[PDB]
Amino acid sequence: MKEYTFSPKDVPAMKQLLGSGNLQPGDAVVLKDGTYHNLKEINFTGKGVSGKPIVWRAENPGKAVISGKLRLKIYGEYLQLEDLLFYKAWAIGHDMIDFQGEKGVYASFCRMTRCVIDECNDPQKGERPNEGDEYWVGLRGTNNRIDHCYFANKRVGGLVLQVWLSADNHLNNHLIDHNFFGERQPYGGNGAEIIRIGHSWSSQLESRTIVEDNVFFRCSGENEIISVKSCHNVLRRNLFYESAGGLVCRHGHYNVIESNTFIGHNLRGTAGIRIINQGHTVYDNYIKDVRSFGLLVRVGVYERPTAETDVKLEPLTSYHRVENVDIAYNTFLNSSLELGSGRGEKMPRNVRFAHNLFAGQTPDLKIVRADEVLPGFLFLDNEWAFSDKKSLSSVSYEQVREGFKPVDMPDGLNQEEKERIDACIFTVGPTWHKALKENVNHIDTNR
Ligand SMILES: [Ca+2]
């Protein structure tokens, strides 16, 4: 096993070695302290093996800085980037860092860990809608991992992290864990998501991406923090803090949403979970002080397509009926329930809303097209805890009244929140980046 060391004056030789395919398992490409400007088109390829990846890393964590024009493609097996700081770099074209070489030649078992992407905005792209688009990280292939990274201050349109699916490469089992997705200011239009899993056109395909133990801090570009657009993904134990958007099951089916926590601080645009499409299981989520919606269950325009469906007549970009969704053991604290809104004639069917706590000061419960929507819900053994003890009796729908029991405000909620936040923030991100430590300390001291 060999270490190959380079300095900023050696960018040409560095790019050649990384892109040659000649690196062997256990080898490392090591960058001495400095700023590496304008790498431009750079490939990282090779074949590591399990337990012996090929590594591209800083000699001293955080002191190798990559800036300027960049088009990095990663493809091969068991390749790892570690401890790199991407600062004021930007994409030559659409994609700054991509896990594919030529179309069809993918990364697998590759990993980006303890890296930062901060302020990586093309000066020649604009900050307003339609003034330019660039994506920071594109996942392709299978079994790749993004972990313990910090991504913040994207100011141009486009995704922080896109999971790309195709008809012949969709089932990925990628893992996105222990990352800190920091501030994103309002974009003023669509296309400023943090994570997008698939696309409308790939949304009927199984992805099996796992998004676990991540922090989203002031992610406020648009109404979707995470836009789930594919099937069988798992979103677990994430923290959404002061973020002006929601976790949205936008397209695709059978997504599993477990034990996430939302701390909105009553800020503009903060939201919880938005449900479109079928088959999801939504368990143990805790949604607090969000102002747009706590839970939204939408009508659909079309049924889920079959092989016979002409998707030119029933587009995948539309909205598909909610059916067969289990919503159990969640908490909605000073956060609304909005059931049956949206355009379309496909009412929700077979939605179970059971064992949830709906609590706060004044309840915010919105039911649309009640006599057509409520038959599609089973409300069972929920708890209702609000200041006015007459409030449940004032609800117009007996089926709703019978599905809730009034209770006094439970006394363990502050401790429950502390456990959830403590579990998410003290193992997140790269420890060497001061802004990660500062932002984590902010959450810790402003719960
Ligand atoms: Ca969007």
Numbering used by the authors: 21 to 467
From the paper:
Here, we show that BcelPL6 of PL6 subfamily 1 from the human commensal gut bacterium Bacteroides cellulosilyticus CRE21 is a monomeric, single-domain polyM-specific enzyme. Alginate lyases break the O–C4 bond to uronic acid residues through a β-elimination reaction that leads to formation of the 4,5-unsaturated sugar 4-deoxy-l-erythro-hex-4-enopyranosyluronic acid (denoted as Δ) at the nonreducing end of the released product. PL6 displays a right-handed parallel β-helix fold similar to several other polysaccharide lyase families. In summary, recombinant BcelPL6 from B. cellulosilyticus is M-specific and produces mainly disaccharides as end products from alginate and di- and trisaccharides from polyM.
BcelPL6 crystallized from 0.2 m calcium acetate, 0.1 m Tris-HCl, pH 7.0, 20% PEG 3000 in the space group P21, and the structure was solved at 1.3 Å resolution with two molecules in the asymmetric unit. Both PISA analysis and SEC indicated that BcelPL6 is a monomer in solution. The 10-“step” asparagine ladder in BcelPL6 is the longest reported to date and spans almost the entire length of the β-helix (10 of 12 turns). Electron density indicated Ca2+ and two acetate molecules near the putative catalytic lysine and arginine residues in BcelPL6. The Ca2+ is assumed to neutralize the C6 carboxylate group at subsite +1, thus facilitating substrate binding and lowering the pKa of the C5 departing proton in the lyase reaction. BcelPL6 has a rather flat and open active site; in AlyGC the C-terminal dimerization domain partly covers the active site forming a cleft, and in AlyF, loops form a closed active site over the nonreducing end of the bound DP4G. The 95% conserved His-271 situated between subsites +1 and −1 appears critical for activity as BcelPL6 H271N was inactive, although it retained the Tm of BcelPL6 WT.
